[PDB]
Amino acid sequence: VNPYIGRSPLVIKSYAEKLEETIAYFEAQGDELNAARTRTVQGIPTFAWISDSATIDTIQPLIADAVAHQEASGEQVLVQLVIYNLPDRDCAAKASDGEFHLDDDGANKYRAYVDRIVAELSTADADKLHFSIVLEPDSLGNMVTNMHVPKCQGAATAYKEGIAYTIASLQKPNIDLYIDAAHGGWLGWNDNLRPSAEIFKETLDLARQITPNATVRGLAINVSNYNPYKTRAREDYTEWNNAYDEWNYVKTLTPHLQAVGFPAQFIVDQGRSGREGIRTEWGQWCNIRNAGFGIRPTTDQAIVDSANVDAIVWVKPGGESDGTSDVNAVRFDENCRSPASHVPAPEAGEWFNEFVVNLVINANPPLEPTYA
């Protein structure tokens, strides 16, 4: 069943608190409407990212808060998590902050990291909640398009085995799993569709060798990207790609999933998808200037318009930087000084207030204000 129907995805308190800085900015500008729109954003659920082992410490307090909120509100709280820590993570990138490396016992360390997450998701409080979990952004797409990269060659089996273990470890009636499936500009190209479907099925089959009847709900798409759900003005860079918006990516990928016997249900990130025409190349990803908040999280089929889409969601939390633009930073990524990038920008994950200001202003549909 679509686990989003009737459920109330969890508002992440630590994220909402960061937005107080954005509210303060707008109030100082004498801009009460945008201050009020920012308050609306405080009440919009986002995914909590578990991108390292230290962040596992945040999970039980998050669950305790979620249970208290469920008791107070009478809602069916749906905790949304991203698991993002494969060994030799981000294999095609020049650099990765992933803490596990295959040559330093990374496969076994990843299993234990998963095991630590499982322990937190197996408490009496956890049992009271429902979870939606996105598995491993920036992973399996690399096996489709980046097998000429030595690091990807050496990580391919590990990515499949790692995700397989995560799937096999999180089979519970109150957990739905979505394997990350990149975005239309990566895997939507004609020649990438079938091998993508095949690798998702291959990974699920490996999971079933660990836990016999293991399943996933489907796929997560556009995570951390900017692609529109339905484009208003198709971009020139999408020429010869039938997945020129994320709704079309669903429609174009679905038949291949069906053909290989992989579940064809999707959740779609639209947290930074409000404004189009912000990039000159599809591969630009880092802090794209003038990005807007997109369609708010919803299951409404009048918007979603696809039996294959469970929900539009906000996975990457807008305002958390994609990377620093400082040329001298230890983790400097040249992509973060692209012609389309918002500069200056802070370290990946750090608060980028100027960028959130623009996310509010460029939101589409416009944000409805929340007034006290």
Ligand X SMILES: O=[N+]([O-])c1ccc(O[C@@H]2O[C@H](CO)[C@@H](O[C@@H]3O[C@H](CO)[C@@H](O[C@@H]4O[C@H](CO)[C@@H](O)[C@H](O)[C@H]4O)[C@H](O)[C@H]3O)[C@H](O)[C@H]2O)cc1
Concerning whether 90 is annotated as a catalytic residue, the answer is yes
Residue 141 near residue 163 (C-beta atoms within 8 A): no
Taking the complex as a whole, how short is the minimal distance between the CB of residue 371 and ligand X, in angstroms? 28
Taking the complex as a whole, how short is the minimal distance between the CB of residue 224 and ligand X, in angstroms? 3
Question: Which of 4, 110, 282, 352 touches ligand X by CB under 6 A?
Answer: 282
Taking the complex as a whole, how short is the minimal distance between the CB of residue 321 and ligand X, in angstroms? 8
Letters for 302-341 (x = contact with ligand X by CB under 6 A, - = none) are --------------xx--x---------------------
Question: Which of 223, 260, 286, 361 touches ligand X by CB under 6 A?
Answer: 223
Concerning whether 31 is annotated as a catalytic residue, the answer is no
371 contributes a contact to ligand X by CB under 6 A: no
Instruction: Please name the residue that has the structure tokens 């509210």.
Output: 23
Residue 51 near residue 84 (C-beta atoms within 8 A): yes
Question: Which of 2, 60, 189, 369 touches ligand X by CB under 6 A?
Answer: 189
Instruction: Say how many C-beta atoms besides its own lie within 10 A of residue 324's C-beta.
Output: 24
Which CB atom, from 93 or from 259, has the smaller least distance to ligand X?
93
Annotated binding-site positions for substrate? 49, 183, 186, 225, 285, 316, 320
List Cα–Cα distances, 60 to 66, 67, 77, 212, in angstroms. 10, 10, 15, 28
283 contributes a contact to ligand X by CB under 6 A: yes
Q: Which of 65, 138, 176, 310 is catalytic?
A: 138
Cα–Cα distance measured from residue 313 to residue 315, given in angstroms and rounded to the nearest whole number: 6
Stretch that binds ligand X, among 110-118, 168-176, 300-308, 342-350 (CB under 6 A): 342-350
Give the pairing of strands 130-135 and 77-83: parallel
Concerning whether 127 is annotated as a catalytic residue, the answer is no
Kindly identify the residues of this chain, within the stretch 71-100, that bind ligand X according to CB under 6 A: 92, 97
Which CB atom, from 65 or from 138, has the smaller least distance to ligand X?
138
Which CB atom, from 185 or from 292, has the smaller least distance to ligand X?
185
- What is the binding site for ligand X (CB under 6 A)? 49, 51, 92, 97, 137-138, 145-146, 185-186, 189, 192, 223-224, 240, 282-283, 285, 316-317, 320, 348-350
